[PDB]
Amino acid sequence: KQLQLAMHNSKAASSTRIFQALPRKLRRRTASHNVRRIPK
Amino acid sequence: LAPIPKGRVKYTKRQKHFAWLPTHIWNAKRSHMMKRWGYQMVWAPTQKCFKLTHRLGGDTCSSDGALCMDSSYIGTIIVKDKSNDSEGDFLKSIIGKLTAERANLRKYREGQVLFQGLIYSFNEENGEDSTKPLGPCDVFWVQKDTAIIRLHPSIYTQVFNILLQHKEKLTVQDCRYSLASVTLKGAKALESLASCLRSTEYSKSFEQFKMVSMITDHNALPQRCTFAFEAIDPRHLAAPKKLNDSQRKTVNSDDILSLHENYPQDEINAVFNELCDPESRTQSYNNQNTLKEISARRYKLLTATPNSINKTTVPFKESDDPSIPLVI
Amino acid sequence: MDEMDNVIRSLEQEYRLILLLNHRNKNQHRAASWYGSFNEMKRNCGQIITLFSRLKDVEWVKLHRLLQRALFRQLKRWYWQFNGVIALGQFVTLGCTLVTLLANVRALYMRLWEINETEFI
RNA sequence: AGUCUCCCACCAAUUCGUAUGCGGAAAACGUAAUGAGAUUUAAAAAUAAAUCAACUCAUUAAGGAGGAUGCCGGUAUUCUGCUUCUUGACCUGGUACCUCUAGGGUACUGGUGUUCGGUACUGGAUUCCGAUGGAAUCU
Numbered sequence: 001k002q003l004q005l006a007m008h009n010s011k012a013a014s015s016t017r018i019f020q021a022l023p024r025k026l027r028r029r030t031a032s033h034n035v036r037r038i039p040k
Numbered sequence: 041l042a043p044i045p046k047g048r049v050k051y052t053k054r055q056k057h058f059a060w061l062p063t064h065i066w067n068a069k070r071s072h073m074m075k076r077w078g079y080q081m082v083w084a085p086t087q088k089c090f091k092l093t094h095r096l097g098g099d100t101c102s103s104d105g106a107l108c109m110d111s112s113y114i115g116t117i118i119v120k121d122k123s124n125d126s127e128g129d130f131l132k133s134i135i136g137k138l139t140a141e142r143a144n145l146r147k148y149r150e151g152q153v154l155f156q157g158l159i160y161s162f163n164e165e166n167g168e169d170s171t172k173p174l175g176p177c178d179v180f181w182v183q184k185d186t187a188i189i190r191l192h193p194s195i196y197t198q199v200f201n202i203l204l205q206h207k208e209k210l211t212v213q214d215c216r217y218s219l220a221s222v223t224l225k226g227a228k229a230l231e232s233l234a235s236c237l238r239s240t241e242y243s244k245s246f247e248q249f250k251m252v253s254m255i256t257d258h259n260a261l262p263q264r265c266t267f268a269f270e271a272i273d274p275r276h277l278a279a280p281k282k283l284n285d286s287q288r289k290t291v292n293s294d295d296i297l298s299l300h301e302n303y304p305q306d307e308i309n310a311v312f313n314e315l316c317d318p319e320s321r322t323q324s325y326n327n328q329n330t331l332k333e334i335s336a337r338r339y340k341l342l343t344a345t346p347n348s349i350n351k352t353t354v355p356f357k358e359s360d361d362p363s364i365p366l367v368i
Numbered sequence: 369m370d371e372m373d374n375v376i377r378s379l380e381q382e383y384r385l386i387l388l389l390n391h392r393n394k395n396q397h398r399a400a401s402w403y404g405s406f407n408e409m410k411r412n413c414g415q416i417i418t419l420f421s422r423l424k425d426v427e428w429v430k431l432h433r434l435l436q437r438a439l440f441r442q443l444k445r446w447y448w449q450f451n452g453v454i455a456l457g458q459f460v461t462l463g464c465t466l467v468t469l470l471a472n473v474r475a476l477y478m479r480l481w482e483i484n485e486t487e488f489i
Numbered sequence: 490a491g492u493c494u495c496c497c498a499c500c501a502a503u504u505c506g507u508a509u510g511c512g513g514a515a516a517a518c519g520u521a522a523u524g525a526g527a528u529u530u531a532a533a534a535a536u537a538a539a540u541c542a543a544c545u546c547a548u549u550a551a552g553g554a555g556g557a558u559g560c561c562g563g564u565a566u567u568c569u570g571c572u573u574c575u576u577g578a579c580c581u582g583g584u585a586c587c588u589c590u591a592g593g594g595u596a597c598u599g600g601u602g603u604u605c606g607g608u609a610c611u612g613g614a615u616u617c618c619g620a621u622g623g624a625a626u627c628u
Binding site: 387390391392393394395396399403404405407408411428442444445448449 | 496497590603607608609611
């Protein structure tokens with residue numbers, strides 16, 4: 001969990017790169033967190 | 041006529057009135073459905089697509105994609121003579137009566153180019169008779185005594201029973217529950233389809249398909265561009281892959297003229313006739329693999345003998361795997 | 369013993385952290401766009417920990433080289449999709465935790481890579 | 490408009506293989522018939538609590554054949570048969586077998602002893618190899 005490895009990984013890139021947000025046709029919303037319910 | 045294909049018991053109970061397409065369980069999660077003409081077909085997806093449809097499927101030159109439609113709802117009737125003589129000449133009369141005198145001519149029979157027009161309903165059996173237009177039709181001739189007809193579902197039965205007035209002389213197969221079809225539109229259409237198809241042997245009709253999948257403006261191609269061959273189970277690839285096409289980029293207008301002379305007639309007919317026979321396409325399923333055994337076969341590729349390749353697609357067996365006939 | 373037996377007790381921690389994080393929040397993130405890489409990463413880790421789970425080295429085939437292409441062919445994707453969750457802005461703990469985990473995995477995978485040169489085939 | 494559900498990757502089967510009154514891919518979804526209850530209750534606050542309506546809950550597989558109640562062979566109603574079929578709980582003890590490398594896998598047969606599975610793909614450009622294949626570089 002050391003940022004040294006993160007710096008080593010980013011060494012295969014620029015200093016401080018910027019990434020775009022997802023295109024709007026590839027986004028999803030979070031569903032519920034509890035298990036599904038059966039019909040009675 | 042033929043009934044609904046047997047399948048899962050739970051989901052075959054709901055098809056008492058409106059049938060299902062092969063992909064219905066997939067489309068239902070991503071579209072708005074309706075119910076007409078005995079089918080549960082798809083109307084429109086769940087996003088606004090007015091401009092994207094135009095600039096990816098219209099006649100523009102800004103296309104960088106394609107549109108695919110599951111048109112399995114259009115029926116298929118395979119009519120063929122039974123006089124045992126390849127000259128036929130009675131199916132010719134039926135097709136010339138069914139439509140106007142169009143779909144039985146030197147352009148459509150011998151050159152076997154596709155036909156699109158209007159289909160009537162003749163009733164000449166006692167004195168006074170007439171005709172009334174019904175709708176569009178797709179008639180394709182093969183070996184001068186076999187015909188394939190594609191019709192909108194609504195006019196499927198009315199014409200069909202007409203042919204049944206002469207089943208003493210012809211034979212008909214309501215194969216609408218055994219043959220499926222897909223329609224592709226756009227510029228980069230054949231490029232995407234060719235990224236998910238390989239062959240079993242070496243065939244010239246795949247060489248032409250490989251070469252013509254690099255046009256991007258399909259209006260230049262001539263009237264006839266039929267392809268027909270035998271593919272392998274597309275689940276082997278595990279990912280779509282290009283045809284290494286970037287090497288050759290000097291296609292001109294002189295090789296196109298070769299496509300009108302170097303036409304593989306016999307190699308198309310032989311692979312085509314494995315669709316107009318029920319037992320042939322029954323053998324086509326001879327050993328269809330489950331997902332887990334394909335997974336195990338792929339896993340067996342981490343200990344191959346070349347040891348300097350690192351391949352991903354599984355190999356192909358000579359006789360212990362099925363071959364899928366395919367027409368475009 | 370330092371060539372091995374000092375890295376394996378670190379993958380033995382990484383796999384447990386990944387498994388806990390997986391079992392924690394499957395339900396509410398199923399349809400997202402980064403399990404298509406998260407489960408691939410977890411499976412590649414599992415296929416590596418399972419080998420060499422004893423008194424000697426039972427290694428007939430040293431070809432897990434083929435299973436160490438998770439650091440040339442399919443490692444840019446996992447790095448470039450675990451930062452999109454950071455950019456989008458609705459969950460930020462997940463992005464940082466995933467990036468730290470990916471850094472740990474890449475470092476350990478090379479640490480296993482260079483120290484072995486028995487690819488004389 | 491919201492402190493709410495479901496869908497937007499696949500599965501011939503460690504994945505809801507779920508024929509369950511009817512519709513639906515699914516839903517903290519819709520709707521039909523019979524019948525019954527409200528802190529003294531399956532349950533709400535200490536929806537209803539004269540009637541009808543409203544809230545909640547319980548029961549009810551499709552098709553087709555046979556006989557009868559009613560009215561002109563028929564339909565609405567009522568009781569009795571038939572057809573629909575992919576060797577499928579988990580854990581575990583035995584025998585036989587296997588092209589698997591003393592251990593694994595498969596057949597026949599015994600024991601009550603809240604989220605976890607497998608498989609998979611980045612967009613674009615340039616380059617290299619006697620090819621429906623393989624390899625390297627940049628962005």
